[PDB]
Amino acid sequence: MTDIVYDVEGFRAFLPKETLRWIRHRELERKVGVVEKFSDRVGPIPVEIRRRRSQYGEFYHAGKGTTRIQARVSAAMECVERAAAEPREEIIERGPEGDKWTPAWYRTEPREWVEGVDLTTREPVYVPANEVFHPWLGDALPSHTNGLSAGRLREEAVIQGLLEVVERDSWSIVEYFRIHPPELEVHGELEELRRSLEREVGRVELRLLPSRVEGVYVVGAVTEAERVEEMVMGFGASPDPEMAVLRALLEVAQGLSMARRGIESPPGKLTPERLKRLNRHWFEPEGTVEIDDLDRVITTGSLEKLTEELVERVAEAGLGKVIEVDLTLENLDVPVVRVRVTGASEYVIDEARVGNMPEKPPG
Numbered sequence: 001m002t003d004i005v006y007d008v009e010g011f012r013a014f015l016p017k018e019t020l021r022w023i024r025h026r027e028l029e030r031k032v033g034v035v036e037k038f039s040d041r042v043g044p045i046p047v048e049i050r051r052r053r054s055q056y057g058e059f060y061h062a063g064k065g066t067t068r069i070q071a072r073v074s075a076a077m078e079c080v081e082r083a084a085a086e087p088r089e090e091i092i093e094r095g096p097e098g099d100k101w102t103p104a105w106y107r108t109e110p111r112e113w114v115e116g117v118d119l120t121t122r123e124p125v126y127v128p129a130n131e132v133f134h135p136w137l138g139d140a141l142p143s144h145t146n147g148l149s150a151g152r153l154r155e156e157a158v159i160q161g162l163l164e165v166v167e168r169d170s171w172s173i174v175e176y177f178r179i180h181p182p183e184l185e186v187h188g189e190l191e192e193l194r195r196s197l198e199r200e201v202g203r204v205e206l207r208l209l210p211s212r213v214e215g216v217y218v219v220g221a222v223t224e225a226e227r228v229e230e231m232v233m234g235f236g237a238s239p240d241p242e243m244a245v246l247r248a249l250l251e252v253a254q255g256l257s258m259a260r261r262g263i264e265s266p267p268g269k270l271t272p273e274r275l276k277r278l279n280r281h282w283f284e285p286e287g288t289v290e291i292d293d294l295d296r297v298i299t300t301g302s303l304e305k306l307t308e309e310l311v312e313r314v315a316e317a318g319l320g321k322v323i324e325v326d327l328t329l330e331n332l333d334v335p336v337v338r339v340r341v342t343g344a345s346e347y348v349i350d351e352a353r354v355g356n357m358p359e360k361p362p363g
């Protein structure tokens with residue numbers, strides 16, 4: 001029974017100030033190849049940028065938070081998870097004995113595997129290296145970082161990774177069927193943050209996405225701006241709808257920081273009004289939802305219980321198996337995991353990663 005002592009940007013067993021002190025003492029950023037740091041503030045939101053070097057090249061990573069401390073923790077741990085996700089021959093198996101997850105798109109049996117755990121059955125299951133590591137170049141589809149998370153504890157990382165998978169499943173459903181999600185109406189501090197971020201662009205719009213996992217809410221934020229590169233999207237998923245809203249808004253601020261520095265992530269220049277027209281489903285909401293009307297199904301006591309309850313709800317969702325792969329580096333004693341949900345949609349990452357899709361949009 002590990003208490004959640006912090007639940008602003010995510011569910012944490014330590015205060016961000018403690019974690020930052022710990023990151024600094026352990027020299028994690030240096031050890032993970034951080035060579036440059038930048039501090040931004042987008043309206044009221046601190047954003048942190050890291051330039052990182054590895055054998056794979058030079059990369060920009062970002063962190064953010066409601067406080068400068070959390071943004072600096074977020075940026076550091078982002079760098080750590082990416083270093084952990086780099087291919088590691090140590091944990092690759094080639095002639096594995098046991099259960100295997102073989103995704104639909106494999107025309108031939110994959111050769112490299114990593115041992116994971118089925119979080120429903122607690123049985124071992126082998127996962128292809130291309131579904132664990134990044135970058136991995138051998139296979140039919142590109143590798144990616146959906147479900148990759150670091151934490152102070154493995155439970156922190158599991159919760160974060162699983163919520164991310166649900167988040168992208170919801171977003172993938174909206175894009176695949178071109179669903180027009182309802183506008184989400186907020187009050188108090190969240191409304192003030194939205195207004196404050198809106199002062200940076202033209203408009204900041206909130207949406208409640210259809211979630212396929214009960215007890216988990218997914219929120220999208222979309223911007224309208226006079227500059228097209230400043231029309232970004234942010235997403236959040238949490239059992240706490242307030243956290244989901246916060247996460248989406250923080251992602252927008254992060255997006256704006258990146259665009260203003262000309263940093264990108266995956267032909268001629270679009271106009272703001274045409275971008276709107278191509279994305280009518282986002283800009284023409286179907287209905288309205290009040291945040292206070294949303295039930296708190298999963299209330300947050302201990303980290304262990306929260307993990308268990310989240311896993312249960314995803315296992316019930318008709319989205320296949322919930323698999324965890326340990327990516328903790330031996331030298332850096334930092335818990336990192338890759339969470340894969342075998343039939344969750346990753347359409348927004350790759351058109352071929354459809355997952356379990358119904359014939360009709362979920363009404």
Ligand SMILES: Nc1ncnc2c1ncn2[C@@H]1O[C@H](COP(=O)(O)OP(=O)(O)O)[C@@H](O)[C@H]1O
Nearest residue numbers: 012019064073074077078081149150151152160
């Ligand atoms: N307070 C914290 N303690 C430990 N790890 C954290 C903390 N905040 C963020 N992280 C980790 O840092 C990385 C980036 O986090 P963040 O930017 O908050 O959200 P996201 O996971 O949506 O990118 C993730 O691996 C996350 O789990």
Ligand SMILES: [Mg+2]
Nearest residue numbers: 081148149150
């Ligand atoms: Mg991550």
